Symmetry: D2
Subunit: 387 residues, 4 copies
């Protein structure tokens, strides 16, 4: 037998210390490693290039995604940066989703303005938009599913096959669901990447990124570029992220229980005009999400009746949703993306992506369902009091 | 509403930084804190006495246990040490369980031999033994329930009310269930203590202890003695412990699911002579555990058929049970207490406790139930193969 | 050759990782260590008993002090507590100095009141007071030299041979000079202990203690008691402490240069009644300090002219001396012991020690001498403007 | 009065904690920061963009270099990467030294093959080579002085002034000497950058980078690019780096004492054909180094008589020089750059740089001079025994 993915995450680096037989893996902060006498480099020589603590996390995420190996970067934006430098040169074309993370948008646009590559932004959910983008022979197609923050679902099998047919590489940003809820490489993707800052770490105390390649040769290119650009992460951050990873399965059971209870409260509630949550049969992408995901996750957004005055009364008084950026932590978060997560975009790359200004996004934590539901009811009720 | 235990643990550090509004609490490593000009101590002056990162952990554990406050120590034994120094003096008698952690037994015996207090070692599950011990007007009674490593259950209401009748204080070692699954202060205990090393931290990468007192004045005496003896913990360890605390609920759901499945495999298996697990209806104390606990936990022990040869074959080959000391980690562990956790005890204190030389203890992790059961069945075949 | 103290501190734990040859030693946070199959304990089993990261610090402090081994505790008071528990029992007498750290006084008095041992507090600088204390056949004598906060020197050779004549063990609190500047075991002490919180760590970001025994058997007993009472320290703290240790020599060079300059400013300044600093030729014990120490260190205290108003004006406005407890940090500190470090003493135990209510203690850091002298001169003017 | 640079390094973040008055600054690991109610972003919102612990280090290095601000990256290579992205686009040309760090060479040459900018590789110590490079209207000139590993000195005033006359920006890599021994912005440079991995950290347990801009507007561009590319560093690493910085002055006093004693042993010793150390009057660049540096540092390389067999007998037996990459730590290191630090280059971008195969580089630590001298003497004897 191999073990399950939950067993492998819990046991990553457990009882793998040759020095002392430590159960928990030691933190190797060391910048440098001795040679074994003249001309004899050990497995490791310099932490920017390779570090064993970082490589445990690399190997664990590669085993979870079904990849040949993993590279750990200082940030999730760094992992995207690494893929752009490893794969694209000027004259190559990149296809990206129209509703990708605002930070992804900012980076694609600033590097396209300089001429590092040509950029096509398409709606990958619309066959016409996709086939128009693939007709232009792109080197690389980026998929982000589900999308942040309207939870649009992209058909992995479909887009990946359409991209193979024209000779394009595919990279999927799998941050929103993590490896425990979606395995893009199962559907033939070349590359999967994460902001480990979110669910993989789970404790809102590490900014980090990962890239896992299906193929050994593309993994070796990512290792080379990560070292040459200096994008590699801190061993201390890898140590906390690996510790975080050990509870990813346990955490997501509670996240998903809470999210199912909260989607049921928000959907058809008098003060809520629209819920974006792939778990609702009415959500465009529900059946796709039910098929290509092991679960519907714990990210959702919703449009509150009553414009800005209603949002303000909803938000001001929350005891258990902290008004902050980021997502995927044990603690429940709320955000208003126009102003907050999506402020990097122009006011009509925002309207083109369909991100309103009366929209709230919830990152549902692992608190008691009943406490979060009391917290949301009190807010809905403060929003009602403003009509 | 106040919130649930799960919410309290999850939200323990959160949005509590006045400097920057950091969601996750900053690590205050600082040994010292400035005065606010001449003669003006701030809230904190010196980390041995008081540290804000350590106090977030003390507060969270006090809220979970229902106490007035918490003191965080460098180890679980140090928490026991703190209580013995704050409460006892020469001429006092301490009652302890016969079947307590071997490390507990080692400290009780070493300090009694010096004359710090008189020691009575009683079976607090037998009303006769309890009543003989309380007859001698003890200053303090220590309860450890469930007991390590035979999972004997002591009746908190019964023992605590009998101890109060003779004006004894009570302290409960709640390590094996954590505050999420047993609240001894709800039964009238003066003190609850923990090795945070186990379930509260959950990641096997901190040694630590905690003591929560029901009453503010006793809490203040523990603060004083912890400061004076220098038993307080590292701010960094309290950071990691608080981080682990946040997943206590989510971890215990999987631990208990896995332990229910493994108990079902071992109970009545032909290769298993006895299983000790409070969740089994045939376990002495089952009905007690169901009423005083919110769950049956994920510690259990069992005795194989086939003596030492069966034990050796079972253990050598386990893929998902690391042979090691400790418990309460996300990673599954197996111990042989005779030769490991209880080796500090004499052969006769072990015989008196009923810790046999064929006893195996499981700390059941949060790996996939399907994998833990495959690993155990293959161990059980390895043991069976040794009967011929 | 074996190497010097400076080489030993710098190189503690360097190239000592068998797993990867990391130059800097890995942090073994692990609570537990696997057995090597049934019945086979490895070197380590459980971090409370024994941890390799903690033991690198123990080993380094034992090499530096000349001892058989070292035990690392959670705090300095915990090292004192460990010694009291390992060595004494009821009916034993302990001799302590009259002018020890207030925290030591607090613990000695609290445990004597319970009856763990009988307590004699003696002036170990006065042969009369010493000989009256040793006439009573004590089990243990504690020496603290130089003393906190009046820098009284006790004659290690004198007090230790007198104690041995009556079969008493001796323990020296060597916190104020560190092993780099005084080696009490070279004078025949049984035990030396430290608050590592001070010069050994040097960065004010760890509370810790250490006890080094000359004799292997007494070391094994301290190991046993530290394990059994749970007084051992955190592996992470031991890592930071070892990192700090590596600059102990380089830091003391600057501390002592700065202290020599500040002593020359304060000694005979119109605003200064008394300076207590062993490097001054007029300090009782100067000649003793020059023979039993490798340097005069960087702790000093002094008494201003002008009573309380002068103290308040001097202290308000200091730019480079933080008013705070502790000492031995790279950052310069000022304390008023009456109301801070020695507030745990009775007004009468303080009077008996000659700790006045107008006494200021400097812990001199490694800032530029020129800046510390500018700051102190401006304080001395603020105090003068007050007469 | 401002304080000195040593005072400012020692006291960076000391007593600057509004929460508790902590002397030592608290580690802010948090990925995210709450809003102060709806629409009220605090100073910080997301660690990839800004983090107060990282900013203490930024601000400390900006104060030491005399710049408007500092950006802290995950690696030193990342700091160079950041500068290339913030300053250059296709069609811009970059001038770099011929003998720049091997990893710098690797990054410039890979990004130039893709067409991100045009590369001119010049000898900045030769007027003709420089004026030919500057005649091509370059956007950016990079200076690395002293050079790694032959310690070539480039004239900061001369190259910076010549680069301004043609409208070029200058960036200096000041890794080898640190801000305590060289301030390139004092001579009018636009940018100074470091691998904090080396002397600034000083304890071989952090890989990191820094960039300090003279001008506020160029600093704000580096902040924007560091966030967008995800090149920013971990707060834990910033915390250790800041702790390291506090002993930079104290450490370099001992480093420089030791390097002076070792240069005297090696220079004209029978087994040493050449020493490269700017402290020697015979070294090309000695007088320049005496003028533009506060000290000669503690990096040196040397050519051993007797080819590969001599190098091997020298290296195998060293007790106090660890055979390893990196430099700037408290612990003494030796490297053979052809095979080790400079293997990133082709065998004849190296002959062009003048890096031979009988060449050892020393990173001289802060151990006792006498232990290092005994160690080097014994190695010279083993090398002698091979003729
Ligand atoms: C900060 C957020 N997201 C980060 C993110 C990133 C960037 O990762 P870092 O923030 O770790 O650079 C990449 N991809 C996706 C889908 C992401 O959501 C947020 O939406 O609040
Ligand atoms: C090491 C073990 N137990 C520790 C322990 C302790 C002591 O805690 P520390 O190991 O954290 O000092 C206290 N109470 C109970 C019930 C315990 O089980 C064990 O049985 O594996
Ligand atoms: C807090 C101080 N000293 C502590 C100390 C201690 C106690 O160490 P900890 O604070 O690390 O427990 C022991 N011995 C001496 C001579 C000491 O000065 C001080 O005087 O500021
Ligand atoms: C690894 C080495 N140097 C790194 C370095 C770097 C790159 O820094 P990181 O290794 O921190 O990426 C940049 N600039 C200079 C002058 C450098 O020496 C070495 O020479 O061994």
């Amino acid at each position: 037998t191999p073990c399950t993915a939950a067993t492998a995450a819990v046991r990553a680096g457990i009882d793998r210390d040759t020095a002392y037989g430590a159960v928990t893996p030691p933190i190797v902060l060391s910048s440098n490693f001795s040679f074994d006498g003249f001309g004899n480099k050990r497995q490791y020589d310099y932490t920017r290039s390779g570090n064993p603590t970082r490589d445990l996390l690399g190997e664990a995420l590669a085993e979870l995604e079904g990849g040949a190996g993993g590279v750990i970067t200082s940030t999730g934006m760094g992992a995207i940066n690494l893929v752009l430098n490893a794969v694209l040169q000027p004259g190559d074309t990149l296809v990206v989703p129209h509703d990708a993370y605002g930070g992804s948008w900012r980076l694609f646009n600033a590097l396209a303005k300089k001429g590092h590559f040509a950029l096509i932004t398409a709606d990958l959910t619309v066959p016409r938009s996709l086939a128009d983008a693939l007709a232009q022979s792109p080197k690389l197609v980026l998929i982000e599913t589900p999308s942040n923050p309207l939870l649009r679902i992209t058909d992995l099998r479909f887009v990946i096959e359409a991209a193979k047919k024209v000779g394009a590489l595919t990279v999927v940003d799998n941050t929103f669901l993590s490896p425990a809820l979606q395995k893009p490489l199962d559907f033939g993707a070349d590359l999967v990447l994460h902001s480990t800052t979110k669910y993989i770490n789970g404790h809102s105390d590490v900014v980090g990124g990962a890239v896992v390649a299906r193929d050994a040769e593309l993994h070796q290119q990512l290792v080379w570029w990560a070292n040459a650009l200096g994008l590699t992460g801190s061993p201390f951050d890898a140590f906390l992220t690996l510790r975080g990873l050990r509870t990813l399965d346990a955490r997501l059971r509670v996240h998903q229980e809470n999210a199912d209870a909260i989607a049921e409260l928000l959907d058809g509630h008098a003060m809520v005009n629209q819920v974006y949550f792939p778990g609702l049969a009415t959500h465009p992408g529900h059946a796709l999400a039910a098929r290509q995901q092991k679960g519907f996750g714990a990210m959702m957004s919703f449009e509150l009746e009553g414009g800005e005055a209603a949002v303000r009364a909803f938000v001001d008084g929350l005891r258990y949703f902290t008004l902050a950026e980021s997502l995927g932590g044990v603690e429940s978060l709320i955000a208003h993306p126009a102003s907050m997560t999506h402020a990097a975009m122009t006011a009509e790359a925002r309207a083109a992506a369909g991100i309103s200004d009366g929209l709230l996004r919830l990152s549902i934590g692992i608190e008691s369902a009943e406490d979060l539901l009391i917290d949301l009811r009190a807010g809905l009720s403060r929003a009602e009091a403003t009509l």
